[PDB]
């Protein structure tokens, strides 16, 4: 009631280091929290669902924005069989000169990552042809997360 | 050969500072005065924490951004011409 595990006094009383471990472990187990009832459990579940939806929408918005900004969608749609898709750029202080030289793939001006997720083909099929569409989708998904 | 008493528990359980010294300050008074005068702003805890975090972040970001391509290989950029993929991909 005083230490970090505010949802369980027994985990807060003991002075060893297992308090941290078991506080992290059982944070989502709403049935064992002290002074719990059915209403609180259901409402917490509802709020957790909303948070999870927000996280998913933010994730897909980030994917779309990064492909739009650092990718080669426009050059890919013209020659699908002879262009390697690009996921995002690479910035790394630890990279040496041969690493920078070897990782420069596609038509980019620096190191990139080839995308094996396959979102390029999906977005091409559903009817997107320019980066403006991807930027618009990113903004829309940001609004949905908000 | 008695090693336990109830009046004073300091020596019973062993609350000793083995290497504690109580000699007066051997530093020069002028040196101490100068250092005390010039170390005043860093005494507070929260202000020191905020200053350290903010200054470290700002300095690290500025050094990373301003640094040219000679120090950082990643800031030089590629030089050799690009090569094709296995099956003729670009």
């Amino acid at each position: 009631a005083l230490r970090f595990p505010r949802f369980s006094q027994g985990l807060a009383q003991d002075p060893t280091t297992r308090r941290i471990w078991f506080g992290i472990a059982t944070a989502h187990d709403f049935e064992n929290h002290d002074d719990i009832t059915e209403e609180r459990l259901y409402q917490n579940i509802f709020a957790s669902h909303f948070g999870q939806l927000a996280i998913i929408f933010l994730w897909t918005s980030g994917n779309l924005f990064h492909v739009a900004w650092q990718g080669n969608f426009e050059a890919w749609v013209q020659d699908p069989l002879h262009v390697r898709p690009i996921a995002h750029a690479i910035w790394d202080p630890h990279f040496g000169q041969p690493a920078v030289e070897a990782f420069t793939r596609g038509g980019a001006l620096g190191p990139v990552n080839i995308a094996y997720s396959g979102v390029y083909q999906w977005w091409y099929t559903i009817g997107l042809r320019t980066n403006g569409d991807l930027y618009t989708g990113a903004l829309f998904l940001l609004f949905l997360s908000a | 050969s008695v090693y336990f008493d109830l009046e004073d528990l300091g020596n019973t359980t062993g609350q000793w500072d083995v290497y504690g010294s109580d000699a007066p300050s051997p530093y020069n008074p002028l040196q101490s005065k100068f250092f005390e005068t010039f170390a005043a702003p860093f005494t507070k805890r929260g202000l020191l924490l905020k200053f350290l975090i903010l200054g470290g972040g700002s300095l690290l970001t500025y050094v990373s951004a301003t640094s040219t391509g000679e120090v950082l290989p990643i800031k030089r950029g590629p030089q050799e011409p690009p090569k094709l993929g296995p099956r003729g991909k670009l």
Partner: peptide, 30 residues
């Protein structure tokens, strides 16, 4: 442009340092 040169150090170092300091302080606080 050079946005990565500014943003990568912030996410890599400064923000984790702030998060670790805050979390440790909140964990040990009575």
């Amino acid at each position: 442009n050079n946005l990565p040169s500014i943003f990568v150090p912030l996410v890599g170092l400064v923000f984790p340092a702030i998060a670790m300091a805050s979390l440790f302080l909140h964990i040990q606080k009575n």
